[PDB]
Amino acid sequence: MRLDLDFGRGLVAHVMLDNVSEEQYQQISDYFVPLVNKPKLKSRDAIGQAFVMATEVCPDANPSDLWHHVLYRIYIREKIGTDPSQSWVRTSGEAFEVALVERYNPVLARHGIRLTALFKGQKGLALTRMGVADRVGSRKVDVMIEKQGGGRSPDAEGFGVVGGIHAKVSLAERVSDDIPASRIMMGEGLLSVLSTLDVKSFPPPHGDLVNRGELGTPDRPSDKRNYIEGHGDFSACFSYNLRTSPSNATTPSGRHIYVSGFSGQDDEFTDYLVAQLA
Amino acid sequence: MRLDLDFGRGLVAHVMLDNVSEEQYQQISDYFVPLVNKPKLKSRDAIGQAFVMATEVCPDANPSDLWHHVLYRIYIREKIGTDPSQSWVRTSGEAFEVALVERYNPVLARHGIRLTALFKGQKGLALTRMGVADRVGSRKVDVMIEKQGGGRSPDAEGFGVVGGIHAKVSLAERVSDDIPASRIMMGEGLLSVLSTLDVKSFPPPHGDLVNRGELGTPDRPSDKRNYIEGHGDFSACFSYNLRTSPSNATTPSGRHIYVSGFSGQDDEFTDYLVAQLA
């Protein structure tokens, strides 16, 4: 599809949306738009549910493009009574957490694995149960990972924490927040996963608006890529930007960057969790 | 003075500006406004030089209030041809570095101390001269501190690096960016200073727009305060928000949070550098 965009001040640009039809785009909008400003509905739920929806409708579309070029831009256009850009920041990040949990828990359940999005204080509780509370910040984990009959500090039903997910729509320099916490988690044998949509496009006039992300290429590794491939600051990285280049067959750290579509049943992320928690 | 503000949605609010007269506000405005969109002038220079100017004009005003309530709001209102909010982010951060250098170097020169703002590639060479380039990220220091006849890797004039400044207009969760780099620097006997304006006000309807910052009270120490007072993640923290509560006489880590006006000659910051470096 061709998406036409107006950035104001007489500036007009367009970007290609592969494996998205004009009809498919309308499906998503007609679903997403009434939820953006809907009373008593958190926008994190609204955006997350929309991302789950959009990815099922266009399972061959780049999930990151649907997030960045569709959900983001529509949200900015439609959001009312609050600043659209800063509202987006507050709601879309947790929305990715909502979408990860919503998407993966049904498949992980049969293996006894459970994801839980941690909000505000819940983050503290997950870290206490992990045993890293003394050495890690109160809110430095996004999605908790639990196992039946496994992990540490089991609950009433026998679910113990085996690790956590650091969720970031985009990296920038903000990925450095997670690295110390991640390394301590890894130092306990806990899983510390970086899940990302790898969203980065450069807007006009200077940019072509192609969402290429910030991880570059494996042959010429940037410091961001080397966070995983060189330093091994995370157990694994899962990107849902199809333009993200996956790690080579081998890396110096042993840790890899994986790339897949969001929608489906079993994928490299599920397989990875199943294999590690076996 | 009383400042009247328009948030655009028919929303009107007001905030008190202590030790700023209407006439003083207009002076600052007449100086800063033509610099906002001035060709061939970087806005980091425009804002920084205006902050130096504004603090000299109102030396008893809260420096953070002049940054947040005056320069920031004027800049957003006036900026043309680029997003006002995102341009502010890109330019104001470096502007604080520029303003630190401009304000302090004339005074620090008399003590053989020199500050230099590090932009782009400058950051790497400084880390090499510090001797920590291998163990810290490529761009994790903002303002390097040098001493004549002291420090590491002296230049042709015998100025060697004795430490660095991590500059943040505001903290949020972003203060965690600097902590790993800071701790290794401190482990080398290098000074690692966190300089901040501690800018945080909450806008209406919920907020009263009073710029109290994010460091709370010594009585009930938050994780942000404990970065310094408990973990000792920085040699010291200097805040130019007058509402910032300074540390008690003693802290568990030994590191303190200092609070002062920006303008002047000798202050707690210069005295600290003289005491630590000479």
Place this chain on the structure above:
DNA sequence: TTCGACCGGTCGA
């Protein structure tokens, strides 16, 4: 509640 973390357009060397 009170106060935390969420993210991207920008603009340089």
Place this chain on the structure above:
DNA sequence: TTCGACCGGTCGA
């Protein structure tokens, strides 16, 4: 230049 770091309104538990 190529791709990095800069910051604050938001809105929840």
